[PDB]
Symmetry: D2
Subunit: 121 residues, 4 copies
């Protein structure tokens, strides 16, 4: 299992120790408070009122937690995933990333604390 922090201003994302392999079932729980610029902060589902202006993940709100598995496209994580299996052909290291517009991470603040484990399968 892995536990760590994902900083909102880390555009490259936070690599974890988790390698997702075919057939794996995983659980993720994410908590905490972060911002994509404003003084306000949002949880790992992000800001439901803010328009998408070029987010790295168009399937989650700005300020949400997302991930990549190997070199997949971004996949929403939000508050977490319960006993989840990846789409076919998706495998490799899990990288966690705050959802913002590329080039605009410098004014971000806060972080999410995230646990990831593999479940029985």
């Amino acid at each position: 299992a892995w536990k760590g922090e994902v900083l909102a201003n880390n555009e490259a994302g936070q690599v974890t120790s988790i390698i997702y392999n075919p057939g794996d079932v995983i659980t993720i729980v994410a908590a905490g408070w972060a911002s994509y610029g404003p003084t306000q902060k949002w949880g790992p589902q992000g800001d439901r009122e803010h328009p998408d202006q070029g987010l790295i993940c168009h399937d989650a709100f700005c300020g949400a937690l997302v991930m990549k598995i190997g070199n997949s496209g971004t996949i929403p994580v939000n508050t977490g995933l319960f006993r989840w299996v990846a789409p076919n052909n998706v495998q490799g290291a899990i990288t966690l990333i705050y959802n913002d517009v590329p080039g605009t991470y410098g004014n971000n603040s806060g972080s999410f604390s995230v646990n990831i484990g593999k479940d029985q399968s």
Copy 2:
């Protein structure tokens, strides 16, 4: 395992099928959007800017998800719990509840979708 919705306006809380027994390890993931009255909605961590005016759980924000186990006091759940063990002497059915002030649930809206499972132990 249990999956279901917890309505923000349900003051009695949502009983689940999960009975927490001594030694159990559990995982909860909660998602969604709810309000304790305002037109805005918040995720399962609630509204970090709103003062506590007599919440059923003083250890979580207004609008957060909390629980009771048997007839315990309220315990914060927020976005979820990862491979969690209860305090000594806490056991019984898990009831999930939206954190608001007693008597003020009528103007609440939305709900959280919640998964709960028992982990290996």
Copy 3:
């Protein structure tokens, strides 16, 4: 989880730290060598050639590992149980017992090493 030895000559059985609760899923693996009297020894499935002359469990061979859950009747364990759920209304402490005829345990020898854990549910 519990790990321990079950002595072949222990007529009362070996109490474990595992309380089986409704809905629990458990796994048991048992290993080792024991005898109900002869110089030979047998593994946890017992002696497939020996007649049942009044065994505590008529659904397993003499010399097999069996169990009780609370005050249930005996249930075969043999080499183990994989992600197993008990019958309806069966619950309580797990006691492991070598299968022999009551009153005839004094000439028994050896033991089984046994792991028991609860699985995800």
Copy 4:
């Protein structure tokens, strides 16, 4: 998870659907009766009285269940493995095999029924 039979006369072994990956925790439970030639049958720990005359696994008795993971050497399974982690650098498909001397499998009989699952990690 995988469930299947491992025939005692199958010299090449039984390939399973389980690919053991770095960091995986697995559980195996094996049951049943088989023989390496004699009319008698033994359980998955094999025959503790028979000399090793060139077995594929010198760390288990003749007639025991063993495995390979990818192209590893043989590893004893016996009655099973509880929440087990492989040695460093061992990975790949799990193949289950009856322990006998190469070239002598033709007079073998019976089989073991085996479950393998991945555990939480």
